[PDB]
Design a protein around this motif. Structure first.
Motif, PDB file in Angstrom:
ATOM      1  N   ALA C  73       7.380 -62.481 -66.809  1.00 23.90           N
ATOM      2  CA  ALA C  73       8.222 -62.350 -67.905  1.00 23.90           C
ATOM      3  C   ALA C  73       8.232 -61.143 -68.410  1.00 23.90           C
ATOM      4  N   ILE C  74       9.299 -60.546 -69.104  1.00 23.83           N
ATOM      5  CA  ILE C  74       9.581 -59.190 -69.767  1.00 23.83           C
ATOM      6  C   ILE C  74       9.523 -59.374 -71.376  1.00 23.83           C
ATOM      7  N   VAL C  75       8.560 -58.597 -72.038  1.00 20.30           N
ATOM      8  CA  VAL C  75       8.660 -58.452 -73.501  1.00 20.30           C
ATOM      9  C   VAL C  75       8.723 -57.217 -73.784  1.00 20.30           C
ATOM     10  N   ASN C  76       9.548 -57.096 -74.671  1.00 22.46           N
ATOM     11  CA  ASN C  76       9.969 -55.763 -75.282  1.00 22.46           C
ATOM     12  C   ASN C  76       9.388 -55.204 -76.450  1.00 22.46           C
ATOM     13  N   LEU C  77       9.336 -53.901 -76.699  1.00 22.08           N
ATOM     14  CA  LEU C  77       8.466 -53.471 -77.861  1.00 22.08           C
ATOM     15  C   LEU C  77       9.072 -53.691 -79.076  1.00 22.08           C
ATOM     16  N   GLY C  78      10.448 -53.819 -79.144  1.00 21.82           N
ATOM     17  CA  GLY C  78      11.085 -54.178 -80.397  1.00 21.82           C
ATOM     18  C   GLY C  78      10.722 -55.329 -80.554  1.00 21.82           C
ATOM     19  N   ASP C  79      10.872 -56.298 -79.752  1.00 21.55           N
ATOM     20  CA  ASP C  79      10.354 -57.792 -79.977  1.00 21.55           C
ATOM     21  C   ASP C  79       9.019 -57.832 -80.479  1.00 21.55           C
ATOM     22  N   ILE C  80       7.864 -57.229 -79.960  1.00 26.77           N
ATOM     23  CA  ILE C  80       6.572 -57.109 -80.428  1.00 26.77           C
ATOM     24  C   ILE C  80       6.459 -56.687 -82.192  1.00 26.77           C
ATOM     25  N   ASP C  81       7.297 -55.451 -82.358  1.00 23.77           N
ATOM     26  CA  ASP C  81       7.215 -54.953 -83.334  1.00 23.77           C
ATOM     27  C   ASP C  81       7.949 -56.208 -84.617  1.00 23.77           C
ATOM     28  N   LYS C  82       9.153 -56.560 -84.085  1.00 25.64           N
ATOM     29  CA  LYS C  82       9.715 -57.896 -84.921  1.00 25.64           C
ATOM     30  C   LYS C  82       8.740 -58.994 -85.198  1.00 25.64           C
ATOM     31  N   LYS C  83       7.943 -59.283 -84.302  1.00 22.56           N
ATOM     32  CA  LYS C  83       7.313 -60.557 -84.446  1.00 22.56           C
ATOM     33  C   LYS C  83       5.873 -60.517 -84.780  1.00 22.56           C
ATOM     34  N   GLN C  88      -4.321 -58.089 -83.869  1.00 19.98           N
ATOM     35  CA  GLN C  88      -4.519 -59.059 -82.956  1.00 19.98           C
ATOM     36  C   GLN C  88      -4.319 -58.639 -81.442  1.00 19.98           C
ATOM     37  N   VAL C  89      -4.630 -59.409 -80.636  1.00 20.43           N
ATOM     38  CA  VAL C  89      -4.456 -59.096 -79.320  1.00 20.43           C
ATOM     39  C   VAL C  89      -2.998 -59.871 -78.849  1.00 20.43           C
ATOM     40  N   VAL C  90      -2.103 -58.935 -78.512  1.00 19.34           N
ATOM     41  CA  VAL C  90      -0.912 -59.556 -77.960  1.00 19.34           C
ATOM     42  C   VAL C  90      -1.223 -59.496 -76.378  1.00 19.34           C
ATOM     43  N   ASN C  91      -1.443 -61.035 -75.924  1.00 19.34           N
ATOM     44  CA  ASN C  91      -1.745 -61.493 -74.555  1.00 19.34           C
ATOM     45  C   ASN C  91      -1.009 -62.926 -74.329  1.00 19.34           C
ATOM     46  N   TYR C  92      -1.390 -63.456 -73.331  1.00 22.38           N
ATOM     47  CA  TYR C  92      -0.780 -64.538 -72.905  1.00 22.38           C
ATOM     48  C   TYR C  92      -0.562 -65.627 -74.019  1.00 22.38           C
ATOM     49  N   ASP C  93      -1.807 -66.078 -74.519  1.00 27.28           N
ATOM     50  CA  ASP C  93      -2.128 -66.997 -75.476  1.00 27.28           C
ATOM     51  C   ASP C  93      -1.183 -66.812 -76.597  1.00 27.28           C
ATOM     52  N   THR C  94      -1.337 -65.595 -77.394  1.00 27.41           N
ATOM     53  CA  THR C  94      -0.516 -65.378 -78.565  1.00 27.41           C
ATOM     54  C   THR C  94       0.975 -65.218 -78.090  1.00 27.41           C
ATOM     55  N   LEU C  95       1.505 -64.546 -77.166  1.00 27.63           N
ATOM     56  CA  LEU C  95       2.714 -64.603 -76.897  1.00 27.63           C
ATOM     57  C   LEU C  95       3.409 -66.078 -76.478  1.00 27.63           C
ATOM     58  N   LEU C  96       2.732 -66.840 -75.975  1.00 24.72           N
ATOM     59  CA  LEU C  96       3.038 -68.131 -75.855  1.00 24.72           C
ATOM     60  C   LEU C  96       3.261 -69.021 -76.818  1.00 24.72           C
ATOM     61  N   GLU C  97       2.199 -68.858 -77.811  1.00 28.65           N
ATOM     62  CA  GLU C  97       2.247 -69.741 -79.086  1.00 28.65           C
ATOM     63  C   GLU C  97       3.320 -69.301 -80.079  1.00 28.65           C
ATOM     64  N   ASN C  98       3.705 -67.750 -80.185  1.00 29.41           N
ATOM     65  CA  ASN C  98       4.694 -67.288 -80.933  1.00 29.41           C
ATOM     66  C   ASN C  98       5.966 -67.393 -80.265  1.00 29.41           C
ATOM     67  N   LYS C  99       6.073 -67.708 -78.897  1.00 31.02           N
ATOM     68  CA  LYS C  99       7.414 -68.280 -78.429  1.00 31.02           C
ATOM     69  C   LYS C  99       8.063 -66.921 -77.844  1.00 31.02           C
ATOM     70  N   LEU C 100       7.336 -66.001 -77.322  1.00 31.96           N
ATOM     71  CA  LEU C 100       8.157 -64.932 -76.916  1.00 31.96           C
ATOM     72  C   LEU C 100       8.302 -65.058 -75.296  1.00 31.96           C
ATOM     73  N   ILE C 101       7.324 -66.041 -74.654  1.00 34.34           N
ATOM     74  CA  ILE C 101       7.395 -66.389 -73.321  1.00 34.34           C
ATOM     75  C   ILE C 101       7.192 -67.755 -73.159  1.00 34.34           C
ATOM     76  N   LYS C 102       7.393 -68.563 -72.134  1.00 30.22           N
ATOM     77  CA  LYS C 102       6.955 -69.935 -71.535  1.00 30.22           C
ATOM     78  C   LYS C 102       5.560 -69.809 -70.997  1.00 30.22           C
ATOM     79  N   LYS C 103       5.043 -71.054 -71.154  1.00 31.79           N
ATOM     80  CA  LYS C 103       3.806 -70.982 -70.240  1.00 31.79           C
ATOM     81  C   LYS C 103       3.900 -71.371 -68.735  1.00 31.79           C
ATOM     82  N   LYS C 104       5.159 -71.263 -68.316  1.00 29.66           N
ATOM     83  CA  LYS C 104       5.405 -71.355 -66.711  1.00 29.66           C
ATOM     84  C   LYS C 104       4.860 -69.984 -66.137  1.00 29.66           C
ATOM     85  N   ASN C 105       4.985 -68.975 -66.778  1.00 23.23           N
ATOM     86  CA  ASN C 105       4.759 -67.348 -66.105  1.00 23.23           C
ATOM     87  C   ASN C 105       3.626 -67.144 -66.966  1.00 23.23           C
ATOM     88  N   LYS C 106       2.601 -66.172 -66.022  1.00 23.33           N
ATOM     89  CA  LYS C 106       1.255 -65.935 -66.754  1.00 23.33           C
ATOM     90  C   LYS C 106       1.188 -64.238 -66.045  1.00 23.33           C
TER      91      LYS C 106
END
Lengths: 209, 114, 145, 66
Positions: C73-83, C88-106
Motif C-alpha cells: 500500500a501507498i501512503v503519502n506525506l500529505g495524508d500523514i500530515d492531515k491525519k 506516535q509511531v506511524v506503523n501498520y497498526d496505527t495506519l490500519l486503525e486510522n483507516k489509511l490502509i486495509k489489513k489485507k496488506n502489510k
RNA sequence: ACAUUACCGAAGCUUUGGAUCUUAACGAAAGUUAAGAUGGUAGGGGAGCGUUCUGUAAGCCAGAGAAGUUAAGCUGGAAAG
RNA sequence: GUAAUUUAAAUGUAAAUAUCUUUUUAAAAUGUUCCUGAGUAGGACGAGGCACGAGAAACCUUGUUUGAAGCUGGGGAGACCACUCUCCAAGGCUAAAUACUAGAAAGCUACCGAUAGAGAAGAGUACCGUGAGGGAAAGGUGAAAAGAACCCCGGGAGGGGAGUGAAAUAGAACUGAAACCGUAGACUUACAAGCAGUCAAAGCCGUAAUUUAUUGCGGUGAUGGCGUGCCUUUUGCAUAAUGAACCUGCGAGUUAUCAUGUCUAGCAAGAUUAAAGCAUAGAAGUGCUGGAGUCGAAGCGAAAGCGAGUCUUAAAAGGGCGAUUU
RNA sequence: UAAUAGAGGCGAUACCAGGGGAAGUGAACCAUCUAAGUACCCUGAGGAAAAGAAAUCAAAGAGAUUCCCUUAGUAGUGGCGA
C-alpha cells in the motif's frame, strides 16, 4: 420537539421530548419512495412459471414434409405460434428481492417518522401500559378511545410485549410494531400512529446512532 | 400477470364501423375492408378540404363571366377596371350579387367601364 | 391516499420495440433492413470482416510477472500530515486503525505527495528518497522493517 | 457470477491502458527480416506507440476488466 | 414571328383564427410579446394514452342493477375518454 | 372450520434410563535386536485424468516391459541437482454439513381460469400405424327439477296455451358479439363505363326551431369535380413481383449475470458487505451481527525496480506515458 | 446332492458411483481444439451416494472429508486462433 402525552383513557398525563435528529429531519421523499419500493419488492414470492417449446409434452417430429404439401412450413407441433404450443419469452421464476444501502434505509425511516410526527392529531403518544389479561376487548377499547381517522392504526412498542402483540393480532385495521422492527410501508400509510414513550426513548437512541 | 383482457380490439373496430356507416357492399361491416376504405377516405377528406377553395373560386369566376356575357366587357377587362378604379369587392360577393340583385351588379359594371 | 410522489427521472420507462408504426420502433424494430444483423447475430470475435484483426497484426511484449509481485500500500506525506500528530509511531497498526490502509496488506510504502510538518516515528517497509529526505529534514525518525 | 464477461486473452496480451483512456501497443514489422530496413525506420519501430482514437471503443469492449 | 395592356393559374407568397417548439426581451415566477421553424424513410432523442395484477383499498361505487357487448349524443391536438 | 389447546386400545418411527452385551482387570519409565504393508516405489515406451493440447512438463492413475530400499529409510516441495523444511504410502471403516422429490401431509403466490392451466377440469381415452410410436376436441339451466299436469296442431319431433319459477326471446341450458343468413318499412336504381370514396349538390322521407316553409340536426341520394386497394420487397410498383376467403381468439427484443454509459437516491478520500449467524414472528420477512473481498487513493517500466516521476539512454538532452488544478 | 443365509425384478422420464462415449455447432471453411465427459447406453447400490482422518497442502503455519462466499475471469494453457 415537544409533544403532549395522553393517558390510556384519552386524557393528558404528561409531556415528552421527540429528538430532532430523528423526528425533525428534513424529509427525503426520494428515500421514502426507494424504501417503499424495496420493502414491497422483497415481499414477492416470484414463483410464477411457464413452459417453453422444450417443456410442453409432445414429440419433436416434423408434422409434415418441408415442400410439396401446400401448408406453411413447421418444425415441431409445440411451436409457440401453434395453439397449445410453448410460450415465447414468457415468465420464469426469478428472485425479486434486493437489499438497499443501510444508510438510505435509515434515512427513509427518519424521514417517514418526521413526516408522521409533523401532524399533531394523527400522531399521538400514550404512557406505558400493558394488557395483562391478554384479551382483545381492552386493547380495542384503548384504540377506539384514541384513534379518530377511521382507518389504519399502527401502534409502536418499546419492547416485545407478547401480551399486547397477541392481544392486538386480531383487531380490524391494526398493526403492532416494535421499535427495532419498523416497516416503512406501514408507517407511511398509517392514518393513526400511536406510540408509547418507551418506544419514543428507544427510537431516540436507536436512530441517533 | 397474464394481461389478456380483450376489450380493446372490439373498441377500435366499433369506432371504425361507426364512422364507415353508409359504404357499399362489404366495406361497411368487415373490419379489414372498412379500415382500408376509411383510411383512404380521410386522406381524400384532407386533400379535398384544400381543393374546395379552388373549386369554389373557379365557380365564382365562371358565374361572373356568365353575368357579363350581355355587355361588351370581357371579365379580364372587368377585373382590370375593378382594380384600376379601386373597388376591392370579392369574387364570391360579386358572384352572389349577380344572382340576388342583378341591377346593382350591372351598375358596378357601368361604373367599371370608365 | 398519501401519494408517494416519486422523484422525476427516477425510472426511465423502457424502449418497448416492435409495437406499432407510431412509436417510431415499428415493424423493423430498430434493426434496419436485412443482413446478418437483422436476425439476432453479429460475428463477435473483434471481427473485421476477415481482415486480420488489430490484436493479431500487432505483436506481444512479455509476461505479466504476477505471482511474484511485491504488492503493497501507498501512503503519502500529505495524508500523514492531515491525519496524525506528534510523537506516535506511524506503523501498520496505527495506519490500519486510522483507516489509511486495509489489513489485507502489510508492507506499506511512504510517498511524498503533500507536505508533512509534524515530528513522527516511522516503522515501515520501504521509503522513497525524496520522502525520507523531507522527513529527516523535518526531524522525524525512520526504521525500515 | 453465473455469467461474468470473459476477457479476450489474445487482445489482453497485446493492448495496454493508460490512465486516461489511450491505448499503448507495440509496433509491428520489427520481428523478422531486418537487414534491408533502414536504421531510422528500425529505431522508430522499436519505440512503443499509441493507437488511433478510432479503435479505443472496440478495445474497451474487448477488455472488459483490464 | 414581332409589339401594347391584361387576366386565369399550386398546399408558393400575403391576410385572418388557433397550437407547439427554439432564441431574445419583459415579468418575482407563472407566463405575456417579438423574431423564425416545424415534408420526411433508415435511425436518434423526448413527451403520453390504454390493458392486467399489487400497495394505497377492512377505501369508494353496485341488486334501488356490477362487469360485458349495444343504440344515440358529446369532449380531447392523437393515442382516446 | 380457523387461534390457543388437545384423542392413542393397537401399529410405526425416535431418543433417554436401567437391563443386556463387550472391553481395560496397569502405567509412568533407557538402550541393544525384530517388524512396520513387494513385482510395490521408481525407470523405458504407449495413453488418460490434473486448468495445464510434449511444452522446460512436475505430480497422480494406468497398458506393455523392467525393477528398489528396509529409519544408517523413503516420498513430496511444477524439468533436474544440492541443502533445507514438511510428511510416513503400497490394510480396511466413518455420522453430520451436501445432491435429489417421483410422491405424502400441512401452507403460500403482483401464478392460470377452459385456444389458458399437466397432453388430460372427462385421458394418453377416441383415433392413426404391422410394430416401435404418435396423439386430440368436448367445463357453465335454475337459489332449488320444483324436468313443462292437462289441452290444441302434428306419426313424431317441435310449436302454440295452461302451470312451476324472480325470469321458460332461463325448456339440456348463464352473459350470446363479429363473420353469415333473413323479414318488414323508407329512399334510390333498368342510356349506363364509380379502387366504390371524398368534396359540391336538386328531389324524397324522418325530426327540431322560426307562425310555417324557409333554415339546422338526419337517413337516402339524380348530377358535377378529383382520385391507380393494402402489405412486404426494390434505383424504381396500380403493376401482370410477393402475401391474405371472411370474422373472432391465440400468436415475437424477455429473464438471469458481467462490462460500460446515463438518470435517480445516499455517503464520501473513502464507499460497500457476500456467504453465514442471532433475535422476534410463522410473517419464502427485515432489524441487527458478520469487512472476508472488490473498486478509488500513483503511475511508469518486459521485468527487477524506482516513484510525482518513470522508461528509452552516459544524459530531466529531447520526447513517450503521467501530474500540481483530485 | 444336503444345510441355512444373501440376491433375481420393479419403482424416481430424480440424485450418486463405475464402465462405454458421440454427433449438430463455434473457430463465419476445416483437420488441432471447442462443444464434452454433453446427450445416451451399461453395470451397482444408498437414502443420500461418492469421498473421508495427510508418504497432504504449500513457503503460509497450518492440520479428516464434503458443500458455499471470495480469491477470479486470476495464475497458466490454446493451428498462442477461437
Amino acid at each position: 420537539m415537544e409533544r403532549k402525552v395522553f393517558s390510556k383513557d384519552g386524557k393528558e398525563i404528561g409531556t415528552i421530548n421527540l429528538d430532532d435528529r430523528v423526528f425533525n429531519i428534513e424529509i427525503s421523499h426520494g428515500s421514502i419512495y426507494n424504501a417503499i419500493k424495496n420493502e414491497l419488492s422483497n415481499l414477492r414470492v416470484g414463483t410464477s412459471s411457464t413452459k417453453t417449446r422444450s417443456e410442453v409434452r409432445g414429440s419433436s417430429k416434423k408434422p409434415w414434409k418441408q415442400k410439396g404439401t401446400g401448408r406453411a412450413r413447421v418444425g415441431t407441433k409445440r411451436n409457440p405460434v401453434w395453439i397449445g404450443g410453448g410460450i415465447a419469452l414468457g415468465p420464469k421464476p426469478r428472485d425479486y428481492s434486493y437489499r438497499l444501502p443501510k444508510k438510505v434505509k435509515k434515512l427513509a425511516f427518519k424521514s417517514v417518522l418526521s413526516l408522521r410526527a409533523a401532524d399533531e392529531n394523527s400522531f399521538k403518544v400514550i404512557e406505558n401500559f400493558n394488557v395483562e389479561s391478554g384479551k382483545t376487548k381492552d386493547l380495542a377499547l384503548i384504540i377506539k378511545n384514541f384513534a379518530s381517522f377511521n382507518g389504519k392504526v399502527v401502534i409502536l412498542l418499546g419492547n416485545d410485549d407478547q401480551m399486547i402483540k397477541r392481544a392486538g393480532k386480531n383487531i380490524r385495521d391494526l398493526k403492532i410494531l416494535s421499535f427495532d422492527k419498523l416497516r416503512v410501508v406501514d408507517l407511511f400509510y398509517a392514518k393513526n400512529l400511536i406510540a408509547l414513550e418507551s418506544a419514543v426513548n428507544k427510537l431516540n437512541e436507536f436512530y441517533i446512532k | 400477470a397474464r394481461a389478456k383482457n380483450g376489450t380493446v380490439h372490439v373498441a377500435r373496430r366499433k369506432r371504425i364501423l361507426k364512422k364507415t356507416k353508409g359504404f357499399w357492399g362489404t366495406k361497411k361491416s368487415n373490419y379489414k375492408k372498412a379500415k382500408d376504405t376509411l383510411r383512404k377516405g380521410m386522406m381524400y377528406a384532407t386533400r379535398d378540404r384544400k381543393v374546395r377553395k379552388r373549386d369554389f373560386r373557379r365557380l365564382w369566376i365562371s358565374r361572373i363571366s356568365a353575368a357579363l356575357s350581355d355587355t361588351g366587357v370581357t371579365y379580364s377587362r372587368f377585373i382590370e377596371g375593378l382594380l384600376k378604379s379601386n373597388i376591392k369587392i370579392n369574387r364570391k360577393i360579386l358572384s352572389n350579387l349577380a344572382i340576388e340583385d342583378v341591377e346593382a351588379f350591372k351598375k358596378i359594371v357601368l361604373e367599371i367601364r370608365r | 391516499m398519501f401519494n408517494l410522489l416519486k422523484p422525476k427521472g427516477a425510472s426511465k420507462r423502457r424502449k418497448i420495440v416492435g409495437r406499432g408504426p407510431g412509436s417510431g420502433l415499428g415493424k423493423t424494430s430498430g434493426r434496419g433492413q436485412k443482413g446478418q444483423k437483422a436476425r439476432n447475430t453479429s460475428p463477435r470475435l473483434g471481427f473485421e470482416g476477415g481482415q486480420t484483426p488489430l490484436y493479431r497484426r500487432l505483436p506481444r511484449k512479455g509476461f505479466s510477472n504476477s505471482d511474484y509481485k511485491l504488492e503493497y500500500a501507498i501512503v503519502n506525506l500529505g495524508d500523514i500530515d492531515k491525519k496524525f500528530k506528534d510523537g506516535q509511531v506511524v506503523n501498520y497498526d496505527t495506519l490500519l486503525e486510522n483507516k489509511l490502509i486495509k489489513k489485507k496488506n502489510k508492507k506499506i510504502k511512504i510517498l511524498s505527495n503533500g507536505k508533512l510538518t509534524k515530528k513522527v516515528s516511522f516503522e515501515v517497509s520501504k521509503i522513497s528518497k525524496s520522502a525520507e529526505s523531507l522527513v529527516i529534514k523535518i526531524g522525524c525518525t525512520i526504521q525500515l522493517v | 457470477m453465473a455469467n461474468k464477461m470473459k476477457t479476450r486473452k489474445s487482445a489482453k496480451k497485446r493492448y495496454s491502458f493508460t490512465v486516461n483512456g489511450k491505448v499503448k501497443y507495440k509496433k509491428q514489422n520489427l520481428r523478422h527480416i531486418l537487414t534491408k530496413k533502414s536504421s531510422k525506420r528500425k529505431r522508430n519501430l522499436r519505440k512503443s506507440g499509441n493507437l488511433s482514437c478510432f479503435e479505443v471503443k472496440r478495445i474497451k469492449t474487448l477488455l472488459p476488466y483490464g
